[PDB]
Design a protein around this ligand. Sequence first.
Ligand SMILES: [Ca+2]
Lengths: 120, 120
Amino acid sequence: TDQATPNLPSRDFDSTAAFYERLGFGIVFRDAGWMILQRGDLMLEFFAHPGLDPLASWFSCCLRLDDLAEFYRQCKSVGIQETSSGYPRIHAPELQGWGGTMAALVDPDGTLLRLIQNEL
Amino acid sequence: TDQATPNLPSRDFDSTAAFYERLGFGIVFRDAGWMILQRGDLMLEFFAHPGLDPLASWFSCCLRLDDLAEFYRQCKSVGIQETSSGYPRIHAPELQGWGGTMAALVDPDGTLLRLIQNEL
Ligand SMILES: [Ca+2]
């Protein structure tokens, strides 16, 4: 099956893996410069980027989810805080101008994951 | 189905849509700041980034393809040059350091799409 995957920066592969592992992602590949995490059909690939400046980062991807509320619930239960300040953090689901609901997760490297509910 | 999609920059949605249309992608959604292109199961999302410098870009994504050969054949056939610098451009499939094969496509905004043959 053809699939397009995001390529996201990681300042430290161990901390990235540990963060996403709490959300159900497992490592399916890892070498000195590349890491792939998977959670069911969700696949994220990370490149080593020790010099990243999170505040100047335009990195982001979308997670289009069949059940956004489950995932969102999961983020809050492992202790990611609902806040506007610092990272990592989450932003609650909000009705968007396009009739759908969307939340946001910001990971330890300041990467924005837009969480979007699939049109059921 | 859950899916993670890349979010890639575009200085001009018209030039982006016209380039990917030659490779079989259609527009699924477009507004002033966001655009979504689709080719079968491949989904790419673009955000407006008029200040981007295509020669200093860190943006990339992977295309993990059931038939890389076919895709690569379509790139050449629409006239994307196989060269070592400048954009857009293509890099021919290369047996990589994992046993698999890989090619590279650089798009009109300097974005690197790594083209990988899936393991059938
Ligand atoms: Ca056209």
